[PDB]
Design a protein around this ligand. Structure first.
Ligand code: DHE
Ligand code: DHE
Ligand code: HEM
Lengths: 439, 559
């Protein structure tokens, strides 16, 4: 039978869902609670349709807030004051961390299926805007950073970059924010276009539509925050965009199957210099790409090394400037023992001689002490000081889950977080590292 | 109440101006399945109804029936209305289309039923037309390397006129001084407009069917050197006019699919296709059929200026990099159609016709500068008419389809600040149904036609205002009436006079005496200095002459 196109979701629909619980004039003018906001972690309690705000040093759950169902990610405004979360269903909640009791100050629905949201990060534009992307309808929406008022909706339906054929369903994938220009960086999956959207004028809207590679998914900025490196996953490529000049710089095959970097991991390789790393969903490989055209021209935008980690099914790779370690999970691996563990490479020991660097295997799920099921360990996230790294031990909604905190210096267990309210923990986002894009 | 069709569907002068998608209508379609509660149409019946729909209803209601000037007619809506309502409503007929080729708006009893039944069935979206399709249609008849390196014919190219012989799908190249038809070229289907490359060497024509032809005027015998199809229905084309980018690119706009395409200015190779489907500027709701209307070229930046109708967006597309594509999507006003640049070539002034607004864009800064109501009904400027009003200073003028008014808007923000982007004067011309207003820097006269006027006396004449006599004292300036059709001496039918166009020197202005395809038409040349008849062009080959474009005035945007 002929398929019936699902309903659209425009301004009228968004505005009807738009609710401002606490108007800006009624919010505080300074932090009114005594929490260490920058060291706070926003944790997704997936199936419960909630998030937990957890103290990064005491591990105390400061509060559990109701949100949209299965929040995909948490993102922070550039000032670190406002917390934005978006559920699979397209529901966005804006939380004021300055309130005596932080809660949702405004909410809005931006589509039927959505996975991304981000805040304005250009100097001078702090707290000005938020942007959300949807799978359905194929669109992104720029909202007021203070009230969530929907200001500009842009359809992503359009032509594929290569064969230049119309595609009626180009889903918006990752959305990042430029630190070089007042622009949002939007990945459009099926058409293989990366959009640089200038938010200085939403009426006379300037955008740069960059032809990249199809199946764009996730990615991150390099250490200098100038270049966006993203995975065109189904095609095993990493695309590099210069956000300063607003143009494609390179497209390179990682040599692995289905790279899935998350925002990736930037570090200074002892021999190669500045690099960005990604693991893969399709195999056990970890690939490094040079990210320094000025200082290391010969290595810039070239895959410098590829080596195995725990196994396939990896989703997130992580490191921090203060750490000498590179953490790699294997969340989707069919083998319980593997999906419940993390590989850790010693960056200092890397020579880049072509051999496979050794890694230590952390039995994260074992450390959490969970009997039932075969819980999957996922996504490392560092605290503000970059001295501890957290991992979610993801089990079923009616099963026991946990968060495992690892001491980065020793690679030993630091703390196991368990609470009856900790249902299906997945994404974890430290306020400071998220607001500053430190990865 | 179906009786509402009396007003809703009444023929009016400004509503005869709706696109007829007769090219897309030629496409054969399979009949869809009929859901519970609705009777199915056979493949033959559905095809017949589909052709009628595209030819006389899709212009106002949309190919996809999502609505344009007329509301949406999707199955979810029509099924609630019911067959009886639809049958009764459609029985009263629909608005007539353009004269000399458009529909009468009358349907037989069987056709009314076919339409009512058709509206209850789920509309199938017509085919897309992407790169593969374009490249399959792309033909380079004479490679650039094999073309002349200098003009090989002895024609005064800059004084040449490219004239649309509409129904025949041909164009006539006519000498501007001798009035000799130098050649008549075939393209297949009706050409809508002719545009010139910035150098004046290449002549581009766009057919209503999406066919683009590029003609080399330097050839001993000018002919199409390259061709390509860019869609199913199209009405606009333009060339790169930024200094330094002469002959680099050409761009074509389409009604269906909703998209524009940038092509190589030498070979027509399709380089970049952009969909115009998107959100309306004001209510910000997705629109699946935003038609591309007029397209102009910036003289301040290497950009094309693209009007997107249903969404009310004006696009400034930077052609310096087609891979890392820079565009400025300007929220303007819905129903953008035609327009032109002011005398300084810096500001784009365009009519959002259905809303009686003129939208002004600063092409240097790339931003909207003003939106002003003309005070008239349905402005249709063509590219408009720029002149230095004796008291108001630089102004741009437009006439209207819905009434007899001529409106002037100040176009000098620096030199005449108070008058800038304000309607400085409004006065009557011959009558309603006007389509084109015209002047030239070397002329002291402003010409205004009345093509669609229901009165023969008026539709066959032109009003001429003496710019030097304008006082801007609030009173209505007088005008002389030139009996253009009468001067052409045509008996049969009711020929309609349309579009003035000057020669290179601005000493003579031409008008088309547009009659039916099986009737006699003519081109009338008026001596600008005396406002007297100069010459009448008549030829058996001159079938349905409409648009005329002088090479010099088109390549330089002199209007
Ligand atoms: C587009 C996209 C982003 C980037 C967001 C941004 O830039 O703000 C993203 C990031 C993420 C991030 C970001 C982490 C970071 O450090 O930036 C996390 C934690 C995450 C948890 C999951 N993701 Fe994600 N995810 C998808 C989409 C996306 N995920 C999918 O389409 C997919 C493959 C399947 C689906 O139906 O959702 C998928 C499965 C998952 C999971 O299985 C996870 C582990 C749990 C869940 O609820 O689905 N996704
Ligand atoms: C989008 C558009 C432009 C701008 C072109 C550009 O910027 O390159 C334009 C310009 C034009 C211009 C430009 C004049 C100028 O000086 O720039 C002319 C002569 C013209 C003669 C006609 N046009 Fe036109 N015209 C349409 C569309 C357009 N017309 C329609 O949709 C409509 C209403 C119905 C249709 O189905 O085509 C229509 C009917 C007509 C006619 O009936 C005319 C009078 C005769 C003909 O040849 O079809 N159109
Ligand atoms: C072509 C023969 C044609 C059809 C078919 C058609 C149908 C149609 C219907 C059934 C309605 C009533 C819908 C309702 O009451 O909800 C309707 C209404 C309007 N139409 Fe129409 N219409 C056809 C042709 C045209 C043409 C050529 C125009 C544009 C000049 C046009 C316009 C309108 C208008 C206006 C209305 C009233 C509602 C509104 O949109 O304001 N139609 N039409």
């Amino acid at each position: 039978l002929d398929p019936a196109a699902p309903p659209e979701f425009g301004m009228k629909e968004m505005r009807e869902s738009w609710k401002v619980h606490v108007a800006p004039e009624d919010r505080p003018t300074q932090q009114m609670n005594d929490w260490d906001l920058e060291n706070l972690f926003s944790v997704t309690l997936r199936d419960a349709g909630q998030i937990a705000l957890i103290d990064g040093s005491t591990y105390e759950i400061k509060t559990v807030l109701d949100t949209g169902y299965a929040v995909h990610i948490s993102r922070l405004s550039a000032s670190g004051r406002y917390l934005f979360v978006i559920g699979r269903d397209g529901k966005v909640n804006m939380i004021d961390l300055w309130m005596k009791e932080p809660t949702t100050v405004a909410e809005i629905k931006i589509g039927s299926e959505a996975r991304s949201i981000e805040t304005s990060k250009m100097e001078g534009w702090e707290d000005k805007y938020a942007i959300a992307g949807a799978y359905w309808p194929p669109q992104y929406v720029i909202m007021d950073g203070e009230t969530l008022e929907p200001k500009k909706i842009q359809s992503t339906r359009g032509m594929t970059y290569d064969e230049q054929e119309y595609h009626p369903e180009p889903r918006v994938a990752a959305i990042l924010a430029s630190h070089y220009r007042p622009e949002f960086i939007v990945n459009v999956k099926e058409t293989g276009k990366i959009l640089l959207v200038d938010y200085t004028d939403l009426n006379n809207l300037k955008t740069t539509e960059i032809s990249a590679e199809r199946f764009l998914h996730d990615g991150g900025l390099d250490g200098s925050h100038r270049y966006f490196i993203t995975a065109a996953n189904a095609r095993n490529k990493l695309v590099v965009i210069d956000t300063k000049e607003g143009k494609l710089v390179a497209i390179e095959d990682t040599g692995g199957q289905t790279p899935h970097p998350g925002r990736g991991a930037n570090f200074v390789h002892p021999t190669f210099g500045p690099v960005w790393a990604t693991s893969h969903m399709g195999d056990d490989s970890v690939a490094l790409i040079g990210t320094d055209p000025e200082g290391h021209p010969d290595n810039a935008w070239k895959i410098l090394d590829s080596f195995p980690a725990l196994g396939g099914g990896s989703l997130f790779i992580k490191t921090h400037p203060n750490s000498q370690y590179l953490y790699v999970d294997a969340t989707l691996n069919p083998e319980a023992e593997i999906s419940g563990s993390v590989a850790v490479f010693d960056i200092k020991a890397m020579t880049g001689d072509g051999s496979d660097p050794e890694f230590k295997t952390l039995p994260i799920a074992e450390w959490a002490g969970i009997t039932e099921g075969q819980p999957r360990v996922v996504q490392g996230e560092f605290n503000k000081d970059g001295t501890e790294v957290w991992f979610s031990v993801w089990n079923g909604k009616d099963q026991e889950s946990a968060l495992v905190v690892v001491d980065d210096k020793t690679l030993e267990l630091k703390h196991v977080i368990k609470d009856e309210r900790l249902v299906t923990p997945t994404g974890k986002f430290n306020v400071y590292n998220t607001m500053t894009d430190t990865y």
